Amino acid sequence: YPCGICTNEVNDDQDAILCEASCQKWFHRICTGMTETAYGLLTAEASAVWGCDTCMA
């Protein structure tokens, strides 16, 4: 899956995040600007998902 921001492949050993607002693209965490701590908290919370800037705007 190509990262929705940088176009490079989102690999298994990279922090990956899926847009669950609509587009269902994968992104590298780092490309989104999300902190590692925010990513850890969001991925641990079952009632919380992420939406990309495009789908949220």
Next chain:
Amino acid sequence: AMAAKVVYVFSTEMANKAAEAVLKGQVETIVSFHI
């Protein structure tokens, strides 16, 4: 059986802000919404 669930959708900005709130001891969790 049939259920419905509310799922909160965070932008990057609001994910980062919610983490800051947790770190600052202001809320227990990133979905601890309040007044």
